[PDB]
């Protein structure tokens, strides 16, 4: 004889999806709406959060079908669109531009063909009157302006109405924490050699996630979280070439570079009540941007990556090659620095091959040497690969500089069916969501069901 | 000795007004934001919903003071405005037009004076440059600017700045459910001969409504629900001639037609990032859009509704007359057909008269005879019976053919005081809620009161 009893607060969970909310430390109470990511509205989490390790528990994880990443991507669209609406637009700027060679003062004849001194007719504070003006624009942002033209025009005039980024607000990657409401738990795997899919033997619960920073990149993941034990290779289908491969390093490579020039920040007025900013003049010598990476640091890193792919690709020769080419958005390493959008031609980084047998000791490589990466500046940017976005980056007075690590690489494989033996790995930003896939690979949202039923030997008493 | 007891969950309801949310069916999850009604956010109801047939209960219904249709109006204005915010505006189109007769190739002289070839100044993508462009505009959309001049202008230019329907979205009448929240129920009547006001002997409770499709019209109801027993004549005050009369037909009258012209869509650019689509040219001859109504199927419907009107108006001669006239919006049967707005005069439909005494056999009228209806196209549409915002209809790029069914008629009575004998009923779209009140007439939102008190012999037990 047994009876049914009810237990409340039981530790059982079921997989589902839910909406989350941001959370970050209130480091700066000042700088009103200066942060694009809106960290002011984020509630601080805890001076010492509660992290607790579960035992004797196995749970499966798969971030290739995770709603955690998909919610993050939908947010960044909304966060950017919210902060760009109260800004001036560049519609009156779309006029004929008279561009000529950039004049340099007394004090390189094959390298100065990047900036053009463009003159145009701009409306003054009164609509009827017009006064001529001058501005500097990059070669990548101008087109020959069709037939019967000895003059130039902006690239995105015939595509969509193109907006501008306000200078009062900044979009540095401040880390944020995505957190779940009451009754919702977020699980965290802890096995150091856990790839994309598989059960986790060290699952630990948490209130919510740790510091996650949104960094926009295409080929190399910057200033991210390092791996714990060794480099791990993550991919949904290794045998499928059309799917990208994420490489997560446990060692960081230092990449630093500048945009060496002082640019005068010139204020120009177009239309009644709208002002945009552009490059004023040149003081000194025009020098192209260039990013350096240490030879020994990069050469050593590619060796462990090559031999890590050797286990997943046995009896195969592994080599690294530059991008296929075509559109500039994905063939180069596009990253952020102070608010100026860069486009670095990454060709000398993947300038080697790996063999299963050989000698690759560090004493052979000469130290203090570095690889110079040519980069080009594009101040008019279309993001998310859609035809309806602008983010015009205003120039910043003085030369800019940045310091960041190298954490993750986005690789693609050719996989020729007739090709045998050697195989070629190329970098490519196939999907924008892949950047956040390297920080949400160990996280999963789950519901809590505090109701449990089981037979027992106790019976409910009835009053008589 | 009797004492009060408290009962919970009793079936007691009280009339109240509340908000309702959308609901739909998972017919197709494809396409990109194509649906104007936004059924993506509408929660699916149930593959087999729960309905309970109540009995022993009589409920009074009054749909003429119902908040269901009034709230359902408030959505339609919000859905239409929401889907037109990210769309281009036709402000630059307010330019002088050099219009003349259309040209037809080798291969009707009193039928082609409907569409006028027009040319105008057109700014290109660089704004400060104009090139001549041409398009075909309808007669109804142009005003000849000044007397004794061959130059025209758009009719809607001086009223209000107004935008264009984006081709990326569509607004076909998908059926939608509005479903009450928890704690509120919707009462459904089931008496076949139940007119607008009266008790209902077969009141049944449902979770929430069935499929209601939003269709806009002015004179005839299209693809609506069919009656069960017979034809019901409904009015708020039959003796008042200023209130419209809604007639519901249990027999479906099929109307099938098309606009017979294959016209290429031409993309015209009017500014930076702004483009609109207009008629390019005419291939073949020019023929007016016509619609067909079967003769035998029409007066057999009109004779049955003629008999039913005799009961409410005893021994009076019943005749149907064409619309009084005035503006085009309410004089003609305005409906939609694959995004094109039609305007057909119904002079060939409401022509005959009804005699209560006589013979009305079907064999007297010859079969295979259809009534032709002249229909005119107008792509500058203002609706809600007010001069507000446009909804510009783009070309079809082909030859659209759409098949529909006539559900009911919106009739009005002259109500002559000095006139005696004959009764004249004329169609009229005085208000457009009546297009939708024929679907929510058997529905009423009610609030549930689960508290009940009554004396009883039981007594509370007090500790001693």
């Amino acid at each position, epitope marked *: 004889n047994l009876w049914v009893t009810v237990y409340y607060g039981v530790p059982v969970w079921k997989e589902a999806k839910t909406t989350l909310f941001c959370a970050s430390d209130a480091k700066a109470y000042e700088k009103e709406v200066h942060n694009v990511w809106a960290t002011h509205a984020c509630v601080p989490t805890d001076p010492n959060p509660q992290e607790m390790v579960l035992e004797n528990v196995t749970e499966n994880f798969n971030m290739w079908k995770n709603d955690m990443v998909d919610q993050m991507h939908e947010d960044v669209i909304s966060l950017w669109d919210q902060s760009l609406k109260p800004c001036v637009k560049l519609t009156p700027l779309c006029v*004929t531009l008279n561009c000529t060679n950039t004049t340099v003062s007394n004090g390189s004849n094959a390298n100065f063909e990047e900036m053009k001194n463009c003159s145009f007719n701009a409306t003054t504070e009164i609509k*009827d*009157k*017009k006064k001529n003006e001058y501005a500097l624009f990059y070669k990548l942002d101008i087109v*020959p302006l*069709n*037939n*019967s*033209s*000895g003059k130039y025009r902006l690239i995105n005039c015939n595509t969509s109405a193109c907006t501008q980024i306000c200078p009062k607000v900044t979009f540095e990657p401040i880390p944020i924490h995505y957190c779940a409401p009451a009754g919702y738990a977020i699980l965290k795997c802890n096995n150091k050699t856990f790839n994309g899919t598989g059960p986790c033997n060290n699952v630990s619960t948490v209130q919510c996630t740790h510091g996650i920073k949104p960094v926009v990149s295409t080929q190399l993941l910057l200033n991210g979280s390092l791996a714990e034990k060794e480099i791990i290779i993550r991919s949904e289908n290794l045998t499928n070439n059309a799917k990208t491969i994420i490489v997560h390093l446990n060692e960081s490579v230092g990449i630093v570079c500048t945009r060496p020039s002082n640019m005068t920040r010139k204020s120009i007025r177009i239309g009644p009540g709208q002002t945009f900013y552009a490059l004023g003049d040149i003081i000194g010598d025009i020098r192209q941007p260039h990013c350096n990476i240490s030879k020994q640091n990069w050469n050593r890193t590619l060796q462990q990556v090559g031999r890590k792919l050797a286990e997943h690709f046995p009896n195969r020769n592994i080599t690294f090659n530059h991008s296929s080419g075509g559109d500039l958005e994905i063939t180069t390493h596009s990253f952020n620095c102070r608010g100026e959008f860069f486009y670095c031609n990454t060709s000398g980084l993947f300038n080697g091959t790996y063999h299963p047998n050989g000698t690759y000791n560090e004493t052979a490589v000469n130290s203090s040497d570095t690889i110079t990466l040519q980069c080009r500046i594009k101040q008019i940017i279309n993001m998310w690969q859609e035809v309806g976005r602008c983010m015009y980056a205003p120039p910043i007075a003085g030369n800019i500089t940045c310091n960041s690590n190298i954490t993750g690489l986005l690789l693609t494989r050719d996989g020729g069916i007739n090709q045998t033996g050697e195989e070629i790995f190329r970098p490519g930003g196939g999907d924008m969501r892949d950047n956040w896939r390297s920080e949400l690979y160990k996280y999963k949202v789950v519901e809590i069901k505090p109701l449990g039923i089981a037979p027992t030997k106790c019976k409910r008493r009835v009053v008589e | 000795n009797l004492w009060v007891t408290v009962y919970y969950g009793v079936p007691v309801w009280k009339e109240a007004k509340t908000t309702l949310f959308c609901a739909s069916d998972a017919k197709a999850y494809e396409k990109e934001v194509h649906n104007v009604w936004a059924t993506h956010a509408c929660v699916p109801t149930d593959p087999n919903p729960q309905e309970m047939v109540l009995e022993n209960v009589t409920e009074n219904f009054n749909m003429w003071k119902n908040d269901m249709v009034d709230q359902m109006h408030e959505d339609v204005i919000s859905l239409w405005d929401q889907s037109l915010k990210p769309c281009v505006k036709l402000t630059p189109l307010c330019v002088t037009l050099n219009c003349t007769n259309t040209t037809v190739s080798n291969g009707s002289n009193a039928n082609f004076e409907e569409m006028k070839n027009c040319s105008f*100044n057109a700014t290109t993508e660089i704004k*400060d*440059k*104009k*090139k*001549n462009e041409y398009a075909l505009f309808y007669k109804l959309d142009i005003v000849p600017l000044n007397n004794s001049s061959g130059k025209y202008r758009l009719i809607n230019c001086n009223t209000s700045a107004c935008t264009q329907i984006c081709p990326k979205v569509t607004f076909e009448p998908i059926p939608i459910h509005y479903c009450a929240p928890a704690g509120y129920a919707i009462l459904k009547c089931n008496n076949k001969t139940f007119n607008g006001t009266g008790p209902c002997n077969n009141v049944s409770t449902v979770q929430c409504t069935h499929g209601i499709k939003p269709v806009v019209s002015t004179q005839l109801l299209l693809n609506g629900s069919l009656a069960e027993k017979e034809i019901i004549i409904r009015s708020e005050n039959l003796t008042n001639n200023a209130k419209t009369i809604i007639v519901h037909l249990n027999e479906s009258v099929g109307i099938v037609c098309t606009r017979p012209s294959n016209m290429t869509r031409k993309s015209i650019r009017i500014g930076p990032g702004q483009t609109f689509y207009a008629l390019g040219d005419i291939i073949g001859d020019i023929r007016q859009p016509h619609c067909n109504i079967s003769k035998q199927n029409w007066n057999r419907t009109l004779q049955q509704v003629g008999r039913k009107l005799a009961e409410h108006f005893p021994n009076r001669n019943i005749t149907f007359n064409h619309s009084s006239g005035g503006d085009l919006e309410i004089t003609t049967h305005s409906f939609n057909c694959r995004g094109e707005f039609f305007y057909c005069n119904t002079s060939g439909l409401f022509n005959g008269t009804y005699h209560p005494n006589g013979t009305y056999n079907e064999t007297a009228v010859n079969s295979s005879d259809t009534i032709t209806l002249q229909c005119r196209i107008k792509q500058i549409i203002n609706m809600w019976q007010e001069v507000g915002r446009c909804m510009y209809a783009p070309p079809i790029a082909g030859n659209i053919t759409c098949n529909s069914n006539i559900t009911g008629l919106l009739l009005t009575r002259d109500g002559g005081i000095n006139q005696t004998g004959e009764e004249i009923f004329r169609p009229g779209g005085g208000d457009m809620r009546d297009n939708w009140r024929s679907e929510l007439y058997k529905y009423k939102v009610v609030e549930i009161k689960p508290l009940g008190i009554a004396p009883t012999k039981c007594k509370r037990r007090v500790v001693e």
Partner: antibody
Framework: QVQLQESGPGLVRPSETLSLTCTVSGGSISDRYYWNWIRQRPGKPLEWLGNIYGFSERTYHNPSFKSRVTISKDTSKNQFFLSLSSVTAADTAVYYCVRDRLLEEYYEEDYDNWYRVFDALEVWGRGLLVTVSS | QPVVTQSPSASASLGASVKLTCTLG???????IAWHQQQEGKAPRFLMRVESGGSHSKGDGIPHRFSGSSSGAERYLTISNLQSEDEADYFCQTWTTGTHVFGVGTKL
């Protein structure tokens, strides 16, 4: 269609200057936009001297040459002239007056000030035998 | 002022089909051209207008045996069914916004 007939002092014994005329048949000079002038000397390739507009009177004289060419508008009686000062003995040439094609593309220097893009030479017609000798 | 060059003369046999060309040279080669024909005295004639994509614009009384094509900085003109009266001087000119440069032409 339009027809162009030219008349004037083709035979000039005293070489001081030269004045020419082109009557226009059909479309008025005021309407239908641009009109042109073309020189042709016996042995060397033809050259362009200047330009005249129909509506706005925007004269695009040849930038290579200095102020040596003048164009009259004469919109009253459907006419346009040509006068060149200080004719040289090497200026012995045949003149052709031209109407241009309709490519309606209008640019803009100042507010409410438009002008049409130049177009290919379309009609052309006959000629006058000129022998400037002294 | 784009400058166009051309071969001084062309050699062909009677009754065959001539392939007349003139080369375009400038900093920007995007400027369009328009062919002409110069007979012996009287008045030369305008034939057709060329644009990007081979937009044929034969205006006044031009048969369908005057096709043309473009290949980089040089454009090809194809003439079929030659006659005795078809020999003349053909000029290719540019437009810009002034300084009509004209062409040297080729005499057969």
């Amino acid at each position: 269609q339009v027809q162009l007939q030219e008349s004037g002092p083709g035979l000039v014994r005293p070489s001081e200057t030269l004045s020419l005329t082109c009557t226009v048949s059909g479309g008025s000079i005021s309407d239908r936009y641009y009109w042109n002038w073309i020189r042709q000397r016996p042995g060397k390739p033809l050259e362009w001297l200047g330009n005249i507009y129909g509506f706005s009177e925007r004269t695009y004289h040849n930038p290579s040459f200095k102020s040596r060419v003048t164009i009259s508008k004469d919109t009253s009686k459907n006419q346009f002239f040509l006068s060149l000062s200080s004719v040289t003995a090497a200026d012995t040439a045949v003149y052709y007056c031209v109407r241009d094609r309709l490519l309606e593309e209008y640019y803009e220097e100042d507010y409410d000030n438009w002008y049409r893009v130049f177009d290919a030479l379309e009609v052309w017609g006959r000629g006058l035998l000129v022998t400037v000798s002294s | 002022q784009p400058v166009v060059t051309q071969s001084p003369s062309a050699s062909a046999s009677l009754g065959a089909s001539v392939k007349l060309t003139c080369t375009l040279g400038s900093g920007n080669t995007n400027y369009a051209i328009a062919w002409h024909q110069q007979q012996e005295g009287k008045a030369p004639r305008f034939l057709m207008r060329v644009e990007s994509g081979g937009s044929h614009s034969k205006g006044d009384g031009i048969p369908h045996r005057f096709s043309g094509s473009s290949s980089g900085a040089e454009r090809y003109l194809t003439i079929s069914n030659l006659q005795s009266e078809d020999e003349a001087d053909y000029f290719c000119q540019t437009w810009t916004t002034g300084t009509h440069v004209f062409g040297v032409g080729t005499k057969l």
